Amino acid sequence: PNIDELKKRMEQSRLNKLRGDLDQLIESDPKLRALRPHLKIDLVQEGLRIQIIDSQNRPMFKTGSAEVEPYMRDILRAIAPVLNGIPNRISLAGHTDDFPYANGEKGYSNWELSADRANASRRELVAGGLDNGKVLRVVGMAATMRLSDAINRRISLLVLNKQAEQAILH
Amino acid sequence: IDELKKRMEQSRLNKLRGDLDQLIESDPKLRALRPHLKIDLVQEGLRIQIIDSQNRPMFKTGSAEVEPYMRDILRAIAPVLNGIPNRISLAGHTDDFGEKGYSNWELSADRANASRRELVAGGLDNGKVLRVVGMAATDAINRRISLLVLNKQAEQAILHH
């Protein structure tokens, strides 16, 4: 056996049960089943990555704002207690491109907005039941320069495996 | 070639720490405060920490607005940082002591951005900062702003490439 590669496969299977259950919440409830073209749940390496992405038609937040849309608020609250299902901690990232590139060297740009959207989703997860201490960090990532897709605007929820969280908290 | 280009970046990151302390000793006011400053090479790149003391907090208490000296340290190191391709990851760490409205999560991320804007106004580039992080709280030693100059592999992992 081993004790380092066994807690290490009990986990891959833990995060896999999470992913399977998240899709069950989504598919079997119809309030989120129509929001599915905004949700991508895949396995990366820090753990489980839940992406909640904007569509040209429907953004999750109001233009240039950190106010969640009614349905975004529904996704955050629908998944919160399924996330409490396991002990792993979370990393919430906000990716924003609502403002022009140059507002960057200004007061409230995509930087403040991206952080604010991350904390806004946080407060929402928390309103849905998320246990205290689950969130590990909030990340704000403004969009980079392009010359001259709306995936560029999304909130990512990373359920961290033991490695990743150890690395983030060394 | 791998470690070849990797050793070039290491040597380049070396010039930076060195070029950083240059001004910390040469500028009488960064020197008066070097004991809030901590530049150490980490496995991810060059880490700069701006620590709080018990009389000298970097931000007004409970606020994300910088104190005169925090404003100085940041804008002074900015020109420098800017001389090299390397990008940055800005992290804020709150001190526990308020939880449902405004929390250390909003506070930490806000200090991360308030710092980035001091840098950005101190001449730092536009597109230099890769991300801002609010780590909240997990004594003035945990009320710090950590500024990470990322090496190419540290920054490639963050971008997900």
Swiss-Prot record, chain A:
Membrane side Periplasmic: residue ranges: 1-170
Superkingdom, natural source: Bacteria
Assigned keywords, A-Z: Cell inner membrane, Cell membrane, Chemotaxis, Flagellar rotation, Membrane, Transmembrane, Transmembrane helix
A single GO BP: chemotaxis
Membrane-related topology note: Single-pass type II membrane protein
Cysteine disulfide links: none
Subcellular location: Cell inner membrane
GO cellular component, one term: bacterial-type flagellum stator complex
UniProt function note: MotA and MotB comprise the stator element of the flagellar motor complex. Required for the rotation of the flagellar motor. Might be a linker that fastens the torque-generating machinery to the cell wall.
Family: Belongs to the MotB family.
UniProt subunit comment: Each stator complex is composed of 4 MotA and 2 MotB subunits. 2 A subunits and 1 B subunit are thought to form a single ion channel, so that each stator complex contains two channels.
Protein name, per record: Motility protein B
Organism in which the protein naturally occurs: Salmonella typhimurium (strain LT2 / SGSC1412 / ATCC 700720)
Gene: motB
